[PDB]
Amino acid sequence: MTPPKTVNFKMKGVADAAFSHEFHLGMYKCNECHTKLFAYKAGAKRFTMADMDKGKSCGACHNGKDAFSSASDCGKCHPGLKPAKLTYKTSVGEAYFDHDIHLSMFKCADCHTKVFKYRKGSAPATMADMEKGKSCGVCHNGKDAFSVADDCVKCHNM
């Protein structure tokens, strides 16, 4: 018999999530999660990220105190939701967006989903759009973060 295996959560329309028994077993024993938090049966009891904020499922520990909050860092549990360096193909060459640099100042919620969706290429914007406050322009306005009005080389390889 082998230890419980890594669990895969299949969601239609959403990037799958994963749970590592091995990693958590380095900290807990079976009864700390079974059966108050999760059952031992193949019986589903599907939860939402909301239920988690309400202390259920992964949220029982991933609350910002016991373990990192399940409200952010989606890429830690959702492999497909991993923030990466983005490259845009524009009419004047490539433009880039580095998540890592921004993650040293903001949390996922600061941009997702009010400003951007977790999907590149969704709502394309022109620099003019940005100058009016859209896309990067929401912050890069020369008052909060540096403006998009000049120093194109900051984001462009022209």
Which residues between 49 and 88 bind ligand HEC (CB under 6 A)?
Answer: 49-50, 57-58, 60-62, 66-68, 70, 72-78, 81-84, 86, 88
CB of 59 to ligand HEC, least distance (A): 8
Q: Which of 12, 36, 91, 114 binds ligand HEC (CB under 6 A)?
A: 91
Judged by CB under 6 A, does residue 93 bind ligand HEC? no
Specify whether the CB–CB gap between 156 and 92 falls below 8 A: yes
What tokens does 55 get?
């202390």
Alpha-carbon distance of 61 to 52, in angstroms, equals: 9
Alpha-carbon distance of 124 to 33, in angstroms, equals: 44
Judged by CB under 6 A, does residue 141 bind ligand HEC? no
**CB-neighbour burial class of residue 53 (10 A; exposed 0-12, middle 13-18, buried 19+):** middle
Alpha-carbon distance of 15 to 38, in angstroms, equals: 21
CB of 22 to ligand HEC, least distance (A): 10
- Residue 116 DSSP SS3: strand
Question: Which positions make up the binding site for heme c?
Answer: 21, 24, 30, 33-34, 42-43, 46-47, 49, 58, 61-62, 68, 74, 77-78, 84, 88, 99, 102, 108, 111-112, 121-122, 125, 127, 136, 139-140, 146, 152, 154-156
